[PDB]
Amino acid sequence: KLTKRMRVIREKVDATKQYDINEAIALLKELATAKFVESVDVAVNLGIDARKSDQNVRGATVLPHGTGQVRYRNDKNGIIHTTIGKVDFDADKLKENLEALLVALKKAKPTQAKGVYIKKVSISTTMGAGVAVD
Amino acid sequence: MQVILLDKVANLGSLGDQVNVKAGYARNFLVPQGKAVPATKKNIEFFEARRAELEAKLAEVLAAANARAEKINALETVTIASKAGDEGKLFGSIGTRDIADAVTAAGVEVAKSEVRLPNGVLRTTGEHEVSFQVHSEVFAKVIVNVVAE
Amino acid sequence: SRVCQVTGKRPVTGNNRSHALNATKRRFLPNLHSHRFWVESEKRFVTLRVSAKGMRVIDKKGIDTVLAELRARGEKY
Amino acid sequence: RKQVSDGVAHIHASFNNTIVTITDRQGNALGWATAGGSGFRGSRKSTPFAAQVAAERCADAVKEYGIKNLEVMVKGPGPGRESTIRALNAAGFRITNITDVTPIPHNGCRPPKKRR
RNA sequence: CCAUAGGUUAAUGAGGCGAACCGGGGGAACUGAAACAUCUAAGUACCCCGAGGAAAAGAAAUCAACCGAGAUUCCCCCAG
RNA sequence: UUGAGCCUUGAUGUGUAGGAUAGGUGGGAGGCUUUGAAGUGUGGACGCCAGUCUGCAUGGAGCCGACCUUGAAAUACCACCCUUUAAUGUUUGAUGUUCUAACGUUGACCCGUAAUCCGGGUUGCGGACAGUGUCUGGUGGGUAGUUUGACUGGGGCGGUC
RNA sequence: CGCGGGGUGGAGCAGCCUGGUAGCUCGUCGGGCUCAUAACCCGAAGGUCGUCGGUUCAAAUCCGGCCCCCGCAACCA
RNA sequence: CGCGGGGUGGAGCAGCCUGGUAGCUCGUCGGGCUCAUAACCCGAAGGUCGUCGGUUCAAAUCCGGCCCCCGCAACCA
Ligand SMILES: [Mg+2]
Ligand SMILES: [Mg+2]
Ligand SMILES: [Mg+2]
Ligand SMILES: [Mg+2]
Ligand SMILES: [Mg+2]
Ligand SMILES: [Mg+2]
Ligand SMILES: [Mg+2]
Ligand SMILES: [Mg+2]
Ligand SMILES: [Mg+2]
Ligand SMILES: [Mg+2]
Ligand SMILES: [Mg+2]
């Protein structure tokens, strides 16, 4: 299954660990090892019912450092996805981006959303290792 | 529990381990047999410095005496012929009581607790292997020949 | 009697309140059980009649510590 | 599926129905198929053809086991007994030996008096 | 084996009775509710154990109220 | 042995348009390969038996993305995950067998002891069962406490309130 | 009073749970049947998912109610 | 005297609770089968719903009187 690249991508990053916000932003340079400049999409598993129309989280947020405002809406299963710009934007730039989105989701809290909202927020680049934040 | 050992328990311990065991196992087996002693503040100190340096290894050479116990008898064979019946078929069946008496006066001065009978109670006339327990881990394999007297 | 040696527990009484709250006198007995203990001092077995709680007391305290308490209370052990 | 190499194909051919059970060499059953479970219910259940299609549906269900060759143990008078072995050969098996295990007492229990 | 259990002897004390009161261990029912089952009667009657001249309790892991009072016991209020 | 939750990791998912035993979504177009390649021998796993998956290796270093047919793009690379499922780790649970130390012993023998009680001691048989305490569902006239109306051309019966 | 659900040709049951593509068994004809009746066997006829909205390429299914059949545990005005 | 049920083609019984439409088996009538009858197969007819009145759009049914039948009751001195 896995080879040279795909394995080292996972060996560098501690899989069984959710990092601090100022931690994950720096470590991503280790992973993006393609010819081009990749980008990091944000994975946020909302604690709402995708089987309930009354709780759909839908909106758009401004990226402080661009890609550059993005648009977003979750799946039919619970998690929402959107990018926060190029991988080559400096670490604290993404820090600026990520935090801006988290607020933006809590900015769009459903009334019938019963339960823990985020529970796990992760980001990863084009060829990125699964890295969840705190 | 939290009972600190004194011996080589066959599943969890290795002389000096603070293993948590069930209360019944410690109170009825480990305590009265000296396989372990309750880990209460003061008792821990008597073991870690006094026993862990000297007395621990003293019991280990006693296990070396158990290695000595494997060959107290030279030939390692005990032949007992008691009244029986025809075609083999022993009259009164022998037991671990008498085998403890048989080897003591003829070699290994063993007690009844270290005597075993891995194959019945020896009703047959012939070859038998009374596997002595000189130690819990290392045994003996003395061949006993019961002949129809 | 059903009086424990160690804890000094005894059969207390009490009501047996049903669903209709009908009071009825019952009697709570201690969980006595004749266990045999090993005293490292005398290197023998001392048979006490202890409750289940009284065994967890002998577990924490010393076995001889408890007998020292029973000797002070003039009990035969 | 366990993949057994060889087995025994019992044939219970009674007057009304033929149950064909393919077991291993140790008697443990691997699969079966009756003449009344493959359609042919009633009058046609006691025919040598129903006994044939019985053994046919028993060849499969044991394909998962892969029994190459097998011994045969027939039992009972029946309408089958000889039409079932032909189909059990046409399925693709190598008949080791054909034995007859019809149970016959040496005048043991008293038989019924029936059928006037 | 030792040693314990047990056995023998001496010394000190205890045992029983007593009117109530007192502490503790058990603990009813008739009755009232216009019937009765929760409840009341009542922790009363009564039984048992223990003690004294009194006994009990008792020197706060108590109240109060953000001001303070300072163990327990008993009486009048508080308040039917 | 065998259930269940979970972790890591690996598979899994052919309406139909169809080069695809493709689920939704989704960042981005180079990964890939000589930290020993396409194609294949042959076997296993999987299987709606349509086509995947794959160990070693003769072979020997290539293989392929948007392109075009989709409601969707290419597990080339990666992320969050859903049904289906594999090995392991961990977590408790329910069974089966064995063991002996708890416990039982109204088995044997010995002593206290001239004593079928009892206690202790050897020993045999059972054995974490049995039995006992607290909680708990069922059964329960064996037992206890009680209720079972009034009017009425006497009461009951009928009827009425 | 909830918490579970279950509702499908005449009708008992599937398939739903894990999205597109409704099978099954009796109740009726044509027969074949045979000197005949019986029985047997062959092919046919019949619900677009109890009802209404949302999401979606596509809803029998997933999410909301309505009408129930219930399965009980409750049940001290 | 009281309580409760019933009365439906020639026979025995459904339908009545929850009003508008009355059905099953036997028998009868006609045909066929057989040498003829019984059995068997095919077709059809046949009911003032005890009786009188009332309620109502409509009464076998809902209500009331009477006649007949059935069971229960007709008790304590
Ligand atoms: Mg008969
Ligand atoms: Mg006195
Ligand atoms: Mg009263
Ligand atoms: Mg005095
Ligand atoms: Mg005092
Ligand atoms: Mg005091
Ligand atoms: Mg102060
Ligand atoms: Mg009574
Ligand atoms: Mg009373
Ligand atoms: Mg009256
Ligand atoms: Mg005729």
Curated annotation (Swiss-Prot), chain A:
GO MF annotations, alphabetized: rRNA binding; structural constituent of ribosome; tRNA binding
Keyword Kinase: no
Matches recorded under Pfam families: Ribosomal_L1
UniProt cross-references to InterPro entries, sorted A to Z: Ribosom_uL1_bac-type, Ribosomal_uL1, Ribosomal_uL1-like, Ribosomal_uL1/biogenesis, Ribosomal_uL1_3-a/b-sand, Ribosomal_uL1_CS
Chain positions found as N6-succinyllysine: K95, K106
A single Gene Ontology CC term: cytosol
Keyword field: Repressor, Ribonucleoprotein, Ribosomal protein, RNA-binding, rRNA-binding, Translation regulation, tRNA-binding
GO annotation (BP), single: cytoplasmic translation
The keyword tRNA-binding is annotated on this UniProt entry: yes
HAMAP family according to UniProt: Ribosomal_uL1_B (MF_01318_B)
Quaternary data: Part of the 50S ribosomal subunit. Cross-links to the P and E site tRNAs.
Entries under NCBIfam families matching the protein: rplA_bact
Family membership noted in the UniProt record: Belongs to the universal ribosomal protein uL1 family.
Purpose: One of the primary rRNA binding proteins, it binds very close to the 3'-end of the 23S rRNA. Forms part of the L1 stalk. It is often not seen in high-resolution crystal structures, but can be seen in cryo_EM and 3D reconstruction models. These indicate that the distal end of the stalk moves by approximately 20 angstroms. This stalk movement is thought to be coupled to movement of deacylated tRNA into and out of the E site, and thus to participate in tRNA translocation. Contacts the P and E site tRNAs. Protein L1 is also a translational repressor protein, it controls the translation of the L11 operon by binding to its mRNA.
Protein name according to UniProt: Large ribosomal subunit protein uL1
Annotated organism of origin: Escherichia coli (strain K12)
Gene it is expressed from: rplA
From Swiss-Prot, chain B:
Residues making up the signal peptide according to the UniProt record: none
Keywords on record: Acetylation, Ribonucleoprotein, Ribosomal protein, RNA-binding, rRNA-binding
Keyword Acetylation carried by entry: yes
Residues found modified as N6-acetyllysine: K89
A Pfam family annotated for this UniProt entry: Ribosomal_L9_C
GO biological process, one term: cytoplasmic translation
InterPro entries: Ribosomal_bL9, Ribosomal_bL9/RNase_H1_N, Ribosomal_bL9_bac/chp, Ribosomal_bL9_C, Ribosomal_bL9_C_sf, Ribosomal_bL9_N, Ribosomal_bL9_N_sf
Molecular function GO labels: large ribosomal subunit rRNA binding; structural constituent of ribosome
PTM annotation (N6-succinyllysine): residues: K71, K83, K112
GO cellular component: cytoplasm; cytosol; cytosolic large ribosomal subunit
ATP-binding is among the record's keywords: no
Family in the record: Belongs to the bacterial ribosomal protein bL9 family.
Subunit (UniProt): Part of the 50S ribosomal subunit. In stalled/collided disomes (pairs of ribosomes where the leading ribosome is stalled and a second ribosome has collided with it) bL9 in the collided ribosome contacts bS6 and uL2, while it contacts only helices of the 16S rRNA in the stalled ribosome; the inter-ribosome bridge thus formed is different from that formed between normally translating ribosomes.
Function field: One of the primary rRNA binding proteins, it binds very close to the 3' end of the 23S rRNA.
The name this protein goes by in its record: Large ribosomal subunit protein bL9
Classification of source organism: Bacteria, Pseudomonadati, Pseudomonadota, Gammaproteobacteria, Enterobacterales
From Swiss-Prot, chain C:
GO molecular function terms attached to this record: rRNA binding; structural constituent of ribosome
Coiled coil location: none
Record keyword Iron-sulfur present: no
Keywords, comma-separated and alphabetical: Ribonucleoprotein, Ribosomal protein, RNA-binding, rRNA-binding
Disulfide bonds: none
Gene3D superfamilies xref list: Ribosomal protein L28/L24
GO cellular component: cytoplasm; cytosol; cytosolic large ribosomal subunit
Statement: the UniProt record of this protein carries the keyword Glycoprotein: no
GO BP annotations listed: cytoplasmic translation; ribosomal large subunit assembly
UniProt xrefs under HAMAP family: Ribosomal_bL28 (MF_00373)
Quaternary structure annotation from Swiss-Prot or TrEMBL: Part of the 50S ribosomal subunit.
Name of the protein: Large ribosomal subunit protein bL28
Organism taxonomic ancestry: Bacteria, Pseudomonadati, Pseudomonadota, Gammaproteobacteria, Enterobacterales
From Swiss-Prot, chain D:
Record GO cellular component, one term: cytoplasm
One MF annotation (Gene Ontology) recorded for this entry: structural constituent of ribosome
Parts of the chain that traverse the membrane: none
SUPFAM superfamilies: Translational machinery components (SSF53137)
Highest taxon of the lineage: Bacteria
Keyword rRNA-binding listed: yes
Keywords in alphabetical order: Methylation, Ribonucleoprotein, Ribosomal protein, RNA-binding, rRNA-binding
InterPro entries with a match to the protein in the record: Ribosomal_uS11, Ribosomal_uS11_bac-type, Ribosomal_uS11_CS, Ribosomal_uS11_sf
NCBIfam families: PRK05309.1, uS11_bact
Subunit text: Part of the 30S ribosomal subunit. Interacts with proteins uS7 and bS18. Cross-links to IF-3. In stalled ribosomes contacts ribosome rescue factor SmrB.
Family: Belongs to the universal ribosomal protein uS11 family.
Function: Located on the platform of the 30S subunit, it bridges several disparate RNA helices of the 16S rRNA. Forms part of the Shine-Dalgarno cleft in the 70S ribosome.
Protein name: Small ribosomal subunit protein uS11
Natural source organism: Escherichia coli (strain K12)
Gene giving rise to this polypeptide: rpsK
